[PDB]
């Protein structure tokens, strides 16, 4: 009996059995004191004969497929200090007789199929330390009051269960409890004030419930408190200033609640705060200067609130800041230059605010910044030339501001830049040919600007998926170079001064799902090649130009087209070439010179009558029976 995995007692009989990761299967010495069969891929029920070893202090069945209920006689072993049934399929209620185990220290039921309530008998276990039952979706009911009687409790977690109701005031009694995890559950009601009575509490995870009332002030008296995750609940009221009295607290998440009030000035006292998340609340006030005393702060997410004022200039005092999101507030003044002294900033989102003045150039001196999102503010000035200094810029959105002048040619310095949106501004001049040097640029939106001059195919990086130049002053002709953007998908040139023929090389853009040429000076006949992208699916808008001739025959090949608008042109002839397009959803042929009959299909009887009326000869016909 010297076999590996077996331990004999000093009186010679078998004491311990140990097996792990042996890839077994199926179902599964009255002195044996510890039994571990774990990672064995066993199935079926726990044999009710498990009670036949009356000497067991430890039963570890964890990480198998084992099924059925938990044999109640497993609770007839009163020397058991450890029970791990976790990571199995066991179903059933938790037996009341569990209270009969005086010596149970660690109890692990988690990641099972279990259901029912938690027996009120857990309070009979006076030496219980870790209770982890979470990851049972049907384990439910209120948390029993008697839970306050487990005096030595250290870890409680019920996370990802159906557990509901209010945490009982009983929790005042666990004076050694370090971690309470009940998260993504059915909990409701207010956090009980009496939780301020757990002195040893370190981490509180109540996130993703519906928890009402307000955050109890008494949480400030928790001297050892470290992590607070309250996010996605109903929490109302002001953030308690007493949280500043919790020295070890490096993490606070109140995101997505109803809170009101000011971000507390006492937060300055918090020397260890790495992450502060308040997003989606009703919080008001200015950002307090004392929060800049927060040296270890990496993430500050204050977005989606009522915060007012100017961004504090002392923000330079936080040298470890990575992510700063203030979007959807009411913030005034300049983006302070001194924000560029946070050398570790990866991401800034100041979008949806009132910020004014120019964008300080020093921000583009940030070497690790992949995201600058300033969209929707009152921003004015030029885009600094220093924009090429920003090596890692990936996502850039300046849209919805007043920024003036030309787009600096340095932006072609940026080799990682995937996404730029400068739409809805005052920008002028030509689009700088230097942008052709953005190797990575897939999405470019310049729409609603004052841009002018002549487009060029040599001006565009070949990797572009998406281009919107609409609503500008752009003139002359669409270049044949357009045939070189083979990955292009949406292309919108609408509302410009563009003219001439449509170049036939558009047919060599093989990826195109959307083409909007609407409202320009284009003329000539719509080329035969336009029907040659089988890819055109989403939309084709040729409206409001000078096009003449007949709708081209190859058009019947656009079998995936769902929207076509040819309105306000000089086009003539019939629509017969359009009568086989079954996926055609929206068609605007109005204000043209078309004539001839349309079938009585439910499609064409949907076309407005004024639509047909703006043409030369259009009318619905009736087929000869």
């Amino acid at each position: 009996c010297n076999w590996t995995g077996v331990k004999c007692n000093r009186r010679g009989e078998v004491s311990e059995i140990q097996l792990k990761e042996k890839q077994l299967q199926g179902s599964l010495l009255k002195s044996l004191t510890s039994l571990t069969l774990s990672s064995l891929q066993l199935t079926g029920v726990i044999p009710k004969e498990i009670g036949d070893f009356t000497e067991l202090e430890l039963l570890d069945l964890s990480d198998n497929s084992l099924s059925g209920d938990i044999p109640v006689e497993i609770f007839r072993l009163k020397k058991l200090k450890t029970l791990s049934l976790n990571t199995n399929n066991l179903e059933g209620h938790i037996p009341m007789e569990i209270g009969n185990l005086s010596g149970l220290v660690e109890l692990m039921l988690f990641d099972n199929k279990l259901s029912g309530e938690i027996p009120r008998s857990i309070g009979e276990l006076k030496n219980l330390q870790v209770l982890r039952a979470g990851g049972n979706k049907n384990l439910r009911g209120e948390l029993p009051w008697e839970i306050g009687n487990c005096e030595n409790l250290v870890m409680l977690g019920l996370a990802e269960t159906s557990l509901s109701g209010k945490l009982p005031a009983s929790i005042g009694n666990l004076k050694r409890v370090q971690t309470i995890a009940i998260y993504t559950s059915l909990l409701s009601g207010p956090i009980p004030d009496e939780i301020g009575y757990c002195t040893e509490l370190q981490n509180l995870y109540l996130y993703q419930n519906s928890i009402s009332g307000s955050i109890p002030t008494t949480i400030g008296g928790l001297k050892k408190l470290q992590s607070l995750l309250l996010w996605q609940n109903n929490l109302v009221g002001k953030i308690p200033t007493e949280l500043g009295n919790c020295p070890e607290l490096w993490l606070i998440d109140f995101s997505e609640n109803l809170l009101t009030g000011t971000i507390p000035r006492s937060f300055g006292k918090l020397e260890n705060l790495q992450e502060l998340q308040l997003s989606v609340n009703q919080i008001s006030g200015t950002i307090p200067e004392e929060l800049t005393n927060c040296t270890k702060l990496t993430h500050l997410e204050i977005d989606n609130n009522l915060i007012t004022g100017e961004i504090p200039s002392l923000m330079s005092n936080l040298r470890s800041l990575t992510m700063f999101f203030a979007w959807q507030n009411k913030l005034t003044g300049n983006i302070p230059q001194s924000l560029s002294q946070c050398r570790e900033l990866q991401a800034i989102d100041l979008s949806y605010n009132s910020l004014s003045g120019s964008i300080p150039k020093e921000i583009f001196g940030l070497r690790n910044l992949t995201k600058l999102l300033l969209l929707s503010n009152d921003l004015s000035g030029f885009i600094p030339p220093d924009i090429g200094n920003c090596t890692n810029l990936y996502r850039l959105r300046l849209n919805g501001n007043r920024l003036a002048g030309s787009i600096p040619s340095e932006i072609g310095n940026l080799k990682n830049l995937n996404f730029v949106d400068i739409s809805e501004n005052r920008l002028v001049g030509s689009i700088p040919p230097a942008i052709s040097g953005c190797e990575s640029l897939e999405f470019l939106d310049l729409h609603t600007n004052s841009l002018s001059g002549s487009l060029l195919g040599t001006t565009l990086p070949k990797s572009l998926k998406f281009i919107d130049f609409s609503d500008n002053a752009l003139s002359s002709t669409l270049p044949p170079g357009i045939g070189l953007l083979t990955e292009l998908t949406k292309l919108n040139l609408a509302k410009n001064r563009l003219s001439g023929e449509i170049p036939r090389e558009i047919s060599t853009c093989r990826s195109l799902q959307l083409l909007n040429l609407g409202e320009n000076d284009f003329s000539g006949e719509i080329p035969d090649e336009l029907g040659q992208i089988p890819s055109l699916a989403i939309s084709l808008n040729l409206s409001c130009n000078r096009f003449v001739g007949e709708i081209p025959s190859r058009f019947s090949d656009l079998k995936n087209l769902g929207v076509l608008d040819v309105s306000h042109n000089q086009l003539t002839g019939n629509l017969n070439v359009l009568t086989d397009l079954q996926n055609l959803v929206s068609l605007n042929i109005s204000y043209n010179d078309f004539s001839g009959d349309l079938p009585n299909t439910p499609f064409f009887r949907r076309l407005p009558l004024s639509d047909l009326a703006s043409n030369r000869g259009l009318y619905i016909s009736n087929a000869i029976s």
């Binding site: 995750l229 997505e256 991401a347 979008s351």
Partner: peptide, 13 residues
């Protein structure tokens, strides 16, 4: 498993 504790996932425009 049931997932380890986490912060609300951050959102930007």
């Amino acid at each position: 498993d049931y997932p380890k504790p986490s912060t609300r996932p951050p959102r930007h425009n």
